[PDB]
């Protein structure tokens, strides 16, 4: 009924902290792939 998007992060609760770590894990693995692809585009 009432809008509530982002409430999980907003609580700083276990679920909140876990999701933050899960995003970070994903995007650090992406960065590794993207920096290598950028290295091989370098020549």
């Amino acid at each position: 009924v009432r809008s509530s998007a982002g409430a999980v992060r907003d609580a700083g609760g276990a679920f909140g902290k876990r999701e933050q770590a899960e995003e970070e894990r994903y995007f650090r693995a992406r960065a590794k792939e993207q920096l290598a692809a950028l290295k091989k585009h370098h020549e």
Binding site: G6, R9, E22, R30, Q34, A36, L38
Partner: protein, 469 residues
């Protein structure tokens, strides 16, 4: 005419007068003091007795001690002679440089400009700060508020604004230190001498300083903002140049009034505040304004106790502003500076008829992606990242690049990090976010967008990181 002290209770002093009773707001001078002690009349109690609030400590006061009615409210030096100087609540110099030899003085109490004196002009004031200029831009001659809990970055932000705006300003600036740290007054003073903004060897200083910090009793703290705005008012009305007014921190004006409210005989209102919180703020805030006579751009740092934006003090402040920069602890804890909340900072000029449709469309597109991102984070908390659709992962990827491109190294923060401050022109800010949202940098890691200036520094940062890989 002469009165006699009859009671002293903390900051509250009662004085009885045999003949002429001083009107409310009158400044009274306590006799037999080593340094000047002003009592400001707050109430007529009856039986020829007034209740007053002291502007300095009341230690050493004796019942029967004499008090002279000055005949007027607190009056302070105004005009060119305040420039480069540091003054008290009551207009005394506190820079140890000697008397302030002004021709002109002004009451710190005054009526707010009338409805007919209002200006409707609205023009963007570019700061070079990406988040601000993009999402909640300031207007010249506008009222700006910087909200934030403790240690989130209000003071750093206000100093960057003094660095960006006030150092390119053709008119005069006023800074009022209200209820903050004395050490920060020292920092600001010596910083401005170093940068030549205050010039100690001639008449060319372009800033006036007024301080009443947290070491001071609540009377001084409750009135210092008025002292600073009085200095600004003179410049606005009597001279032809635009004025800048910076105040750190205006919450402390409201807090100071709550500190004496019970001793003045009031029943407390909600959250322990004085019943007059809103009207007291109103009579002060309504003077801080551009008029048909002249323009004041006001920037006020606003403390949000315990990060609670619904607290009556900052809650009541919102109605007084044209642009709000809302700082957020969650954002600062992610390492994003300035820690501006992109979904809680606003501006009356964020309107396509004012900033243009391109600016407006990019601002609202950025906000849309960040808002959609919030819904996705709830899902991720259960599902994880890998399980999201390719479309959602793309919304997350882009929203994260946007969050980080909103961060920016401040010149004034070159002390914390060692990284050089950056100023980003408006059109460059719009272009960069346009390009991120359009998907033009889907191939770079999000870290490339963290703590840079223009979009070209991100492309270049990605190149350094590729080599170090």
């Amino acid at each position: 005419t002469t009165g006699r002290i009859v009671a002293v209770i903390g900051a509250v002093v009662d004085v009885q007068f045999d003949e002429g009773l001083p009107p409310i707001l009158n400044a009274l001078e306590v006799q037999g003091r080593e340094t000047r002690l002003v009592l400001e009349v707050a109430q007529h109690l009856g039986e020829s007795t007034v209740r007053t609030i002291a502007m300095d400590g009341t230690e050493g006061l004796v019942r029967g001690q004499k008090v002279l009615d000055s005949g007027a409210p607190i009056r302070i030096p105004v005009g060119p002679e305040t420039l480069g100087r540091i003054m008290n609540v009551i207009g005394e110099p506190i820079d140890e440089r000697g008397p302030i030899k002004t021709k002109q003085f002004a009451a710190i109490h005054a009526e707010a400009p009338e409805f007919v004196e209002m200006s409707v002009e609205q023009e963007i004031l570019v700061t070079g700060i990406k988040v601000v200029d993009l999402l909640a831009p300031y207007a010249k001659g506008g009222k700006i508020g910087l909200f934030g809990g403790a240690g989130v970055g209000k003071t750093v932000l206000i100093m960057e604004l003094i660095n960006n705006v006030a150092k390119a300003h053709g008119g005069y600036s006023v800074f009022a230190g209200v209820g903050e740290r004395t050490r920060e007054g020292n920092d600001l003073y010596h910083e401005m001498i170093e940068s030549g903004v205050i010039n100690l060897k001639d008449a060319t200083s372009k800033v006036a300083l007024v301080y009443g910090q947290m070491n001071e009793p609540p009377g001084a703290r409750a009135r210092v903002a008025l002292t600073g705005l009085t200095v600004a008012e003179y410049f606005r009305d009597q001279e032809g140049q635009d004025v800048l007014l910076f105040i750190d921190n205006i919450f402390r004006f409201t807090q100071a009034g709550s500190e004496v409210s019970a001793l003045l005989g009031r029943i407390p209102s909600a959250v322990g505040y004085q019943p007059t919180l809103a009207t007291d703020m109103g009579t002060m805030q309504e003077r801080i304004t551009t008029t048909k006579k002249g323009s004041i751009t006001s920037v006020q740092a606003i403390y949000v106790p315990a990060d609670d934006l619904t607290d009556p003090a900052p809650a009541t402040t919102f109605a007084h502003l044209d642009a709000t920069t809302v700082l957020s602890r969650a954002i600062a804890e992610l390492g994003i500076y300035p820690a501006v909340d992109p979904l809680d900072s606003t501006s009356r000029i964020m309107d396509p008829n004012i900033v243009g449709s391109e600016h407006y469309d990019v601002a609202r597109g950025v906000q849309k992606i960040l808002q959609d991102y919030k819904s996705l984070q709830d899902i991720i908390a259960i599902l994880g990242m890998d399980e999201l659709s390719e479309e959602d992962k793309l919304t997350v990827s882009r929203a994260r690049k946007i969050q980080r491109f909103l961060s920016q190294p401040f010149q004034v923060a070159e002390v914390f990090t060692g990284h050089l401050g950056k100023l980003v022109p408006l059109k460059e800010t719009i272009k960069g976010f346009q390009q991120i949202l359009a998907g033009e940098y889907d191939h770079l890691p999000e870290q490339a967008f963290y703590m840079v200036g223009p979009i070209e520094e991100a492309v270049a940062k990605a190149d350094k990181l590729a080599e170090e890989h």
